[PDB]
């Protein structure tokens, strides 16, 4: 899941 500290970690949208 998207967490604010971790960018793209387990978060496709942040790429």
């Amino acid at each position, epitope marked *: 899941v998207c*967490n604010p*500290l*971790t*960018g793209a*970690l387990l978060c496709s949208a*942040a790429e």
Partner: antibody
């Protein structure tokens, strides 16, 4: 937000260890549970993280195939399994919710 | 992996003094998304780390405003305007731009001068 980890572990070389991290306060399924270890020397090394809503994982390649992360949603608990232990693995292991809040650490000593 | 170089290893201060801790990354931490995922933590003796500053300059919930962070690209600094006793411990920078893996600086021990 509070993360309670299980107590110290002692293992032989080649054996496995399993550590737990019980989360309370915030939404268990809202944060990836990250794991980090603190070596002798105090340096920190990120191991990986798990999404608890459905279970997807991301590993530091250094631990890929050696570490396994899991969760149990029914008890808001995350687990870290690490196999093929050596003395390089003796460390304090932390769980960390979204990289924001840290557990108290679990000591792992790998020795004959 | 991104290597985070922290300086100094040890920073002796008197209570009330200013302190600055620098962290230099081996490549830019500016993400294609425009964010800079550079964070700072403090680990007090016998404690776990606690988050102080996130995304270069944002203070985390509850953190006193004597702590500030700045920087860009590959160079970042944490500043404490006036050191308090509770501030002694080990400071670490961490990056989450280039993941996996997240990486950390080696730690800077803020200690007391005498």
């Amino acid at each position: 937000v509070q993360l309670l980890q299980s107590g110290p572990e002692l293992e032989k070389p080649g054996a496995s260890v399993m550590i737990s991290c019980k989360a309370s306060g915030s939404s268990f399924t809202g944060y990836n549970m990250n794991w980090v270890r603190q070596n002798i020397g105090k340096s920190l090394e990120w191991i990986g993280a798990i999404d608890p809503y459905y279970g997807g994982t991301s590993y530091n390649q250094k631990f890929k195939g050696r570490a396994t992360l899991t969760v149990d949603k029914s008890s808001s608990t995350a687990y870290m399994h690490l196999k093929s232990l050596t003395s390089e693995d003796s460390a304090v292991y932390y769980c960390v919710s979204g990289m924001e809040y840290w557990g108290q650490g679990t000591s792992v000593t790998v020795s004959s | 992996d991104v290597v985070m170089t922290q300086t100094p290893l040890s920073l002796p201060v008197s209570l009330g003094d200013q302190a600055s801790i620098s962290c230099r990354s081996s490549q830019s931490l500016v993400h294609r998304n425009g964010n800079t995922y550079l964070h700072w933590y403090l680990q007090k003796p016998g404690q776990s780390p606690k988050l102080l500053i996130h995304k270069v300059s944002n203070r985390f919930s509850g953190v006193p405003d004597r702590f500030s962070g700045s920087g860009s690209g590959t160079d970042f600094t944490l500043k404490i305007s006036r050191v308090e006793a509770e501030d002694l411990g080990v400071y670490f920078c961490s990056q989450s731009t280039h993941v996996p893996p997240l990486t950390f600086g080696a730690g800077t021990k803020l200690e007391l001068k005498r």
